Design an enzyme around this catalytic site. Structure first.
Site, PDB file in Angstrom:
ATOM      1  CG  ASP A 182      -1.787  -1.183   1.357  1.00 41.92           C
ATOM      2  OD1 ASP A 182      -1.374  -2.231   0.810  1.00 41.92           O
ATOM      3  OD2 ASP A 182      -2.864  -1.107   2.026  1.00 41.92           O
ATOM      4  CG  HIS A 204      -3.261   3.884   1.598  1.00 38.49           C
ATOM      5  ND1 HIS A 204      -4.389   3.711   0.821  1.00 38.49           N
ATOM      6  CD2 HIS A 204      -3.241   2.851   2.474  1.00 38.49           C
ATOM      7  CE1 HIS A 204      -5.030   2.627   1.228  1.00 38.49           C
ATOM      8  NE2 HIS A 204      -4.354   2.090   2.226  1.00 38.49           N
ATOM      9  CG  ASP A 256      -5.064  -0.221  -1.100  1.00 38.76           C
ATOM     10  OD1 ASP A 256      -5.989  -0.333  -1.939  1.00 38.76           O
ATOM     11  OD2 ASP A 256      -5.166  -0.606   0.095  1.00 38.76           O
ATOM     12  CG  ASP A 283      -9.420   6.387  -1.293  1.00 37.71           C
ATOM     13  OD1 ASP A 283      -9.789   7.523  -1.633  1.00 37.71           O
ATOM     14  OD2 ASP A 283     -10.037   5.358  -1.625  1.00 37.71           O
ATOM     15  NE  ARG A 284      -8.114   6.841   5.138  1.00 38.45           N
ATOM     16  CZ  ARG A 284      -8.466   5.985   6.085  1.00 38.45           C
ATOM     17  NH1 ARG A 284      -8.696   4.713   5.767  1.00 38.45           N
ATOM     18  NH2 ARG A 284      -8.587   6.398   7.340  1.00 38.45           N
ATOM     19  CG  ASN A 304      -8.936  -2.562  -0.343  1.00 42.16           C
ATOM     20  OD1 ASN A 304      -7.717  -2.420  -0.436  1.00 42.16           O
ATOM     21  ND2 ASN A 304      -9.612  -2.243   0.755  1.00 42.16           N
ATOM     22  CG  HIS A 305      -8.421   2.140  -0.862  1.00 45.69           C
ATOM     23  ND1 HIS A 305      -9.153   3.119  -0.229  1.00 45.69           N
ATOM     24  CD2 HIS A 305      -8.033   1.271   0.102  1.00 45.69           C
ATOM     25  CE1 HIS A 305      -9.199   2.862   1.066  1.00 45.69           C
ATOM     26  NE2 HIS A 305      -8.526   1.748   1.293  1.00 45.69           N
ATOM     27  CG  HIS A 332      -4.628  -5.052  -2.215  1.00 50.88           C
ATOM     28  ND1 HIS A 332      -3.691  -4.074  -1.976  1.00 50.88           N
ATOM     29  CD2 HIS A 332      -5.600  -4.883  -1.285  1.00 50.88           C
ATOM     30  CE1 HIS A 332      -4.091  -3.324  -0.966  1.00 50.88           C
ATOM     31  NE2 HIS A 332      -5.248  -3.792  -0.530  1.00 50.88           N
ATOM     32  NE  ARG A 355      -9.567  -5.436   5.784  1.00 53.47           N
ATOM     33  CZ  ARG A 355      -8.526  -4.606   5.739  1.00 53.47           C
ATOM     34  NH1 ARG A 355      -8.682  -3.345   5.353  1.00 53.47           N
ATOM     35  NH2 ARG A 355      -7.316  -5.052   6.073  1.00 53.47           N
ATOM     36  CG  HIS A 377      -6.035  -5.492   2.354  1.00 54.92           C
ATOM     37  ND1 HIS A 377      -6.689  -4.340   1.979  1.00 54.92           N
ATOM     38  CD2 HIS A 377      -6.982  -6.326   2.838  1.00 54.92           C
ATOM     39  CE1 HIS A 377      -7.970  -4.456   2.262  1.00 54.92           C
ATOM     40  NE2 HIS A 377      -8.183  -5.655   2.771  1.00 54.92           N
TER      41      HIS A 377
HETATM   42 FE   LIG Z   1      -5.143  -0.004   3.731  1.00 55.17          FE
HETATM   43 ZN   LIG Z   2      -6.437  -1.777   2.443  1.00 56.59          ZN
END
Ligand SMILES: [Fe+3]
Ligand SMILES: [Zn+2]
Ligand SMILES: [Ca+2]
Ligand SMILES: [Ca+2]
Ligand SMILES: [Ca+2]
Ligand SMILES: [Ca+2]
Lengths: 397, 166
Positions: free
Chosen positions: A85, A87, A113, A116-117, A145-146, A194, A249, A276
């Protein structure tokens, strides 16, 4: 007449580096052959520069074009650097390439990933897609997943595109995200994904035959590949169950040591490398398998000091000369942004409106029919992980 | 018998009369103008970080006090009959310290610092201030005209909140 005063004539904190005032044009980014100049792009992005929107689309679409050509389960051979990740942590991604080596003479695999974040997601995408365009057969990108409409609408990445670029670029990213491979078979011995395994995925063929060009559904193999975690008690199980509903999740599953052993043996695989999940050391080596003496599962996590609050190291996995070596690295400074990318006007104006109106009301109430927040405010590992469990969940509906 | 006061407001005869009553009661030493001390003597104003900005906007001739015309004209910005553009220009004036018609980097910082206090580090504040200007500065003079200001905040409908009864 006089010129206007030089803009930083009254800037209060002069030492703080000022961002570029111009967007990079197409002539500055693309050479004679329509090939991107990656070092020009990087130097601009590090300064918080932005590019002409038509260039953003051009980069994202050419990236998408290349990815779409690729197998749902790509095959990549050692030597390689595997990363988890990111991010949106662009300033850490920079550090990562300094640590893992130049993409010009180094093979890379990213487990997803990218967004996001962190508030430099679009720069991560732009920079990574440029590398993909330059080195389509030595740099590899999997889907996390993002990378989907559902999570980017909920988190900040949709806002990010709308603010810094436009809805058009966001859309072009969603189609590029649909193009991303789901998995990689590495050196014919590690499956790299992932998230993890799926009760409906028993052979590599079940991955190979997946139709990936879509938004991830809320259940099913594709969802699981992106979403599943090892169980909290992996390798030291109470129940002998292979899968259970992933309480953390809110979708997909926990898989446990037996589930992995079975899958590893039925497919002649040494181990499963994945991402992840945040790790204090930036990686985790799970219980070794009796058969091989090699860790059955590996988490690799490439975003250090996650969310500015975890104080975790990051890592990449370097696989060369029959040695898997974990390179750890710490964070690097990055510029500040208000939550949700609001400008200081949108941020303050409400407070202004409330406080001046409050003042006038208090003033005007000096006569009472004898006529017959006080401050604005901005919107370690175990402690920051429990304050964030609600955000590692699939948003409802 | 004195010469007429001349002014521009949304208020009618009655309302001006009522505003005039509050003015006199607020005018302690009864000098015909309103000093900072006289405003600050109302307890509810003492912990308001914006009091001085409001006074500076009301004080249009520049002499540091608020006389009756500037009092009427200031309050009128908040009339229920005020258009959106009027409420926005007032909010614009909060940031525009030297009243030159532009909002400079330095001014934006100062007015925010005034409201944010020590919540943000100076460095952080300077950066989001930089990024706010750069984004809204369509003609590249490094500051923010009123037209540019509106382009950013016009859709927030804060002007519906800036209203008082008189
Ligand atoms: Fe994450
Ligand atoms: Zn994740
Ligand atoms: Ca007085
Ligand atoms: Ca005056
Ligand atoms: Ca000014
Ligand atoms: Ca301007």
């Amino acid at each position: 007449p006089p010129p206007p005063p030089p803009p930083g004539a009254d800037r209060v904190v002069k030492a703080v580096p000022f961002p570029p005032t111009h967007r990079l044009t197409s002539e500055e980014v693309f050479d004679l052959d329509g090939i991107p100049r990656v070092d020009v792009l990087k130097n601009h992005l590090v300064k918080e520069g932005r590019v002409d929107e038509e260039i953003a689309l051009r980069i994202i679409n050419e990236g998408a074009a290349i990815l779409r050509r690729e197998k749902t389960m790509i095959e990549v051979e050692a030597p390689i650097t595997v990363c988890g990740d990111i991010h949106g942590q662009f300033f850490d991604l920079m550090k990562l390439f300094e640590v893992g080596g130049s993409p010009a003479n180094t093979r890379y695999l990213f487990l997803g990933d990218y967004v996001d974040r962190g508030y430099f997601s679009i720069e991560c995408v732009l920079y990574l897609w440029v590398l993909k365009i330059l080195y389509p057969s030595t740099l590899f990108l999997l889907r996390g997943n993002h990378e989907c409409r559902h999570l980017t609408e909920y988190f900040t990445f949709k806002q990010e595109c709308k603010i810094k670029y436009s809805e058009r670029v966001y859309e072009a990213c969603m189609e590029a995200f649909d193009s991303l491979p789901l998995a990689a078979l590495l050196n014919q011995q590690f499956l790299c994904v992932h998230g993890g395994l799926s009760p409906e995925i028993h052979t590599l063929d079940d991955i190979r035959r997946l139709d990936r060009f879509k938004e991830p559904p809320a259940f099913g193999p594709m969802c699981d590949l992106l979403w599943s975690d090892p169980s909290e008690d992996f390798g030291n199980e109470k129940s002998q169950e292979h899968f259970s509903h992933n309480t953390v999740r809110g979708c997909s599953y926990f898989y446990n040591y037996p589930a992995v052993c079975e899958f590893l043996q039925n497919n002649n695989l040494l181990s499963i490398i994945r991402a992840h999940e945040a790790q204090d050391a930036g990686y985790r080596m799970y219980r070794k398998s009796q058969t091989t003496g090699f860790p059955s599962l590996i988490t690799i996590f490439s975003a250090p000091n996650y969310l500015d609050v975890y104080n975790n190291k990051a890592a990449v996995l370097k696989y060369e000369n029959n040695v898997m070596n974990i390179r750890q690295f710490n964070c690097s400074p990055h510029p500040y942004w208000l939550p949700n990318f609001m400008d200081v006007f949108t941020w303050s104006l409400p407070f202004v409106g409330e406080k001046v109106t409050e003042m006038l009301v208090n003033v005007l109430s000096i006569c009472s029919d004898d006529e017959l927040a006080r401050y604005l405010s901005v919107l370690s590992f175990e402690e920051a992980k429990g304050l964030d469990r609600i955000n590692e969940r699939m948003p409802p509906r | 018998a004195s010469y007429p006061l001349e002014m521009c407001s949304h208020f009618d005869a009655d309302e001006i009369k009522r505003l005039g009553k509050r003015f006199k009661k607020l005018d302690l030493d009864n000098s015909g103008s309103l000093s900072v001390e006289e405003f600050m003597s109302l307890p509810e104003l003492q912990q308001n970080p914006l009091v001085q900005r409001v006074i500076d906007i009301f004080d249009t001739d520049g002499n540091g006090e608020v006389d009756f015309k500037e009092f009427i004209e200031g309050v009128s910005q908040f009339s229920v009959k005020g258009d959106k553009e009027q409420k926005l220009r007032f909010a614009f004036r909060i940031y525009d310290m030297d009243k030159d018609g532009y909002i400079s980097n330095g001014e934006l910082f100062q007015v925010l610092k005034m409201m944010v206090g020590n919540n943000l580090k100076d460095t952080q504040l300077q950066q989001i201030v930089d990024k706010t200007i750069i984004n809204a500065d369509k003609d590249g003079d490094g500051r923010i005209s009123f037209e540019e200001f509106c382009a950013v905040v016009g859709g927030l409908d804060i002007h519906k909140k800036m209203v008082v009864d008189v």
